[PDB]
Design a binder for this molecule. Structure first.
Ligand SMILES: [Ca+2]
Lengths: 223, 10
């Protein structure tokens, strides 16, 4: 996250870190046994880390649980990033409490101007590399489809939305992928892609979760 | 444009 602030330990209880010997993507806990993340974060050997703040030090409240299976959307296209969403089933149920809780799925899509919270352990510099130890937060509004399509002509499908600031300086970045975009207490987006980070006229692009609620529920129900 | 994972996919 570029241009954000320190969230505060466990203030984003649904935030998870996907780890394979190092942090590589974020994700959101949607119930005691399932995490939602981005399809491009897929890999074997994923350990899900819940209740994290400083990802480099064990401080208490952490729960490390192995992924039992990862389900990438059948129509995910790596070339266009359309349908960039993945479900991860945990090997055992997480213990839910004040420091580890799930986030609700949306019943309706959000509209332009809606304020949301994006969080993650990604790069904090628009130019260069600097990974934080603690979870960073950023409040950002959802942009209109017309502004989104103007920024990325021919690259925005109906399953994506832009969020952020056209003036630059505030954005999600490498390492934030798969993480949550929460608005009004509902998970509306998943950190997916963008051109650089915090660049002027190049807002972040996110997977539009409200288009997948049915798929998520049916998939979870049969697994 | 790149995905925001580690490492990024462009
Ligand atoms: Ca820790």
């Amino acid at each position: 996250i570029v241009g954000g602030y320190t969230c505060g330990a466990n203030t984003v209880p649904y935030q998870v870190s996907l780890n394979s010997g190092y942090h590589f993507c974020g994700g959101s806990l949607i119930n005691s046994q399932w995490v939602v993340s981005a399809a491009h974060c897929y890999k074997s050997g994923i350990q899900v880390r819940l209740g994290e703040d400083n990802i480099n030090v064990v401080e208490g409240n952490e729960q490390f649980i192995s992924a039992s299976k990862s389900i990438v959307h059948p129509s995910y296209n790596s070339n266009t990033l359309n349908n960039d969403i993945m479900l991860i089933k945990l090997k055992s149920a997480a213990s839910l409490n004040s420091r580890v809780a799930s986030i609700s799925l949306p019943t309706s899509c959000a509209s332009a101007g809606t304020q949301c919270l994006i969080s993650g352990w990604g790069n904090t510099k628009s130019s260069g590399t600097s990974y934080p130890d603690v979870l960073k937060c950023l409040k950002a509004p959802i942009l209109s489809d017309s502004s989104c399509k103007s920024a990325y002509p021919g690259q925005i499908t109906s399953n994506m939305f832009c969020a952020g600031y056209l003036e630059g300086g505030k954005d999600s970045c490498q390492g934030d992928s798969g993480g949550p975009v929460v608005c009004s207490g509902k998970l509306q987006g998943i950190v997916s892609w963008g051109s650089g980070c915090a660049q002027k006229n190049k807002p972040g692009v996110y997977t539009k979760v409200c288009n997948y609620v049915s798929w998520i529920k049916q998939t979870i129900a049969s697994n | 444009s790149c995905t925001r994972s580690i490492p990024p996919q462009c």
